Amino acid sequence: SNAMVKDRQIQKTKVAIYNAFISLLQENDYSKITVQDVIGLANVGRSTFYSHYESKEVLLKELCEDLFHHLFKQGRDVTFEEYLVHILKHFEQNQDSIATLLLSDDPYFLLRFRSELEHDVYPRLREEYITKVDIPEDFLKQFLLSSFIETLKWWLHQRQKMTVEDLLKYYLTMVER
Amino acid sequence: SNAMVKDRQIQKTKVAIYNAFISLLQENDYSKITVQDVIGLANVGRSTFYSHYESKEVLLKELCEDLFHHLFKQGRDVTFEEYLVHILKHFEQNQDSIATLLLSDDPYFLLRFRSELEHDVYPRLREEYITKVDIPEDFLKQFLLSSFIETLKWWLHQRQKMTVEDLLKYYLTMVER
Ligand code: NI
Ligand code: NI
Incomplete structure (x- = not known):
């Protein structure tokens, strides 16, 4: 459906962040990376990130x-x-x-x-x-x-x-x- | 022997700080210690502490x-x-x-x-x-x-x-x- 597709789209953006966090953890300490780093790869803005993850800690x-x-x-x-x-x-x-x-x-x-x-x-x-x-x-x-x-x-x-x-x-x- | 008296005072001050440093290390740990705290305990002036030790590292x-x-x-x-x-x-x-x-x-x-x-x-x-x-x-x-x-x-x-x-x-x- 047309909600089927939007779902499939919020699921791909959650994974983009996830994968970004991992790729950045190959080069940096957890203590050393910042949410802006995580976006700069995920290509998803500050507002939506916070709609999936309360903070870097989770x-x-x-x-x-x-x-x-x-x-x-x-x-x-x-x-x-x-x-x-x-x-x-x-x-x-x-x-x-x-x-x-x-x-x-x-x-x-x-x-x-x-x-x-x-x-x-x-x-x-x-x-x-x-x-x-x-x-x-x-x-x-x-x-x-x-x-x-x-x-x-x-x-x-x-x-x-x-x-x-x-x-x-x-x-x-x-x-x- | 007033140069013998001077040396004797230098020495007493030097170990007086050294002992203080050890004392502070018994509880607090190295990175959290200051010249303030060493001289407070060693009962010495900041100028004198520095003519003996470049810093808390030496x-x-x-x-x-x-x-x-x-x-x-x-x-x-x-x-x-x-x-x-x-x-x-x-x-x-x-x-x-x-x-x-x-x-x-x-x-x-x-x-x-x-x-x-x-x-x-x-x-x-x-x-x-x-x-x-x-x-x-x-x-x-x-x-x-x-x-x-x-x-x-x-x-x-x-x-x-x-x-x-x-x-x-x-x-x-x-x-x-
Ligand atoms: Ni396996
Ligand atoms: Ni012994």
């Missing part, structure tokens, strides 16, 4: 929300380490600036990300790779999660990076117990 | 050469483990505000610190505790250093900290591959 939120739903909140039937590999797969191509988001140190992205790791990566990592029990649980939790995040950051700064499977390997052997 | 500099010379490059006749106990012992007590520098996240301290581990802790840690060329060196090095620094940071953010003995032990039985 793009980060939405984005993350999306990025983390695709990484973890999958019921995609695979082995634990296929699951790890897929996660790492996204980082190495910087699927939607996810790498740049992590390397930027944006405190908010680093927070919600560490929290997903706690819910969907740690419990399996624990039960499946750590066999002994002479190291307390909290030290375990902290050493494991933090060394995962740090292995990952280091790999992303690497100009010549190992295959995701090599890194997943060298990490799992480093921590297994 | 203080951070000097404080840093001091702490590491002490922590690391000491030719004390101890075994590698005693050595690390002494380093951990400093952070446990916040000796010269050192625990607070680290937890402050200040680029300058952190950068200098890491560089010192790299040079004085990593070589022995890896030789003494790693007996498996199963893993490539660079990966090995990145992983040990980050695990140390973060286990350090983690321990320090603890409400009821564990003993430096338990920490070093759990750390070491964790990387020992």
Whole structure:
């Protein structure tokens, strides 16, 4: 219909902003970009942006929300380490600036990300790779999660990076117990 | 000896500021500190503060050469483990505000610190505790250093900290591959 077409048009403009925000997050810190940057790409004016997004803050939120739903909140039937590999797969191509988001140190992205790791990566990592029990649980939790995040950051700064499977390997052997 | 008297007054003023700077670092962190606050505590004039230190940076500099010379490059006749106990012992007590520098996240301290581990802790840690060329060196090095620094940071953010003995032990039985 004639409302069918206007809808299809508000849906394409919402995506333009979304995609603009991502492309700009490839070159800049979240703290460093401004709504005018976001328009200058989206080609949609100040008034309409604010009709979809209360502020820049809900793009980060939405984005993350999306990025983390695709990484973890999958019921995609695979082995634990296929699951790890897929996660790492996204980082190495910087699927939607996810790498740049992590390397930027944006405190908010680093927070919600560490929290997903706690819910969907740690419990399996624990039960499946750590066999002994002479190291307390909290030290375990902290050493494991933090060394995962740090292995990952280091790999992303690497100009010549190992295959995701090599890194997943060298990490799992480093921590297994 | 009135030039001997003059030197003596210079010296007393200089450490008087240096001590104040350390004191302010116990709570507030480096970036949030001013000449006002240092001189208020050191009970000194702004003109005199400046004939001693170009700025609050040359203080951070000097404080840093001091702490590491002490922590690391000491030719004390101890075994590698005693050595690390002494380093951990400093952070446990916040000796010269050192625990607070680290937890402050200040680029300058952190950068200098890491560089010192790299040079004085990593070589022995890896030789003494790693007996498996199963893993490539660079990966090995990145992983040990980050695990140390973060286990350090983690321990320090603890409400009821564990003993430096338990920490070093759990750390070491964790990387020992
Ligand atoms: Ni995918
Ligand atoms: Ni000492």
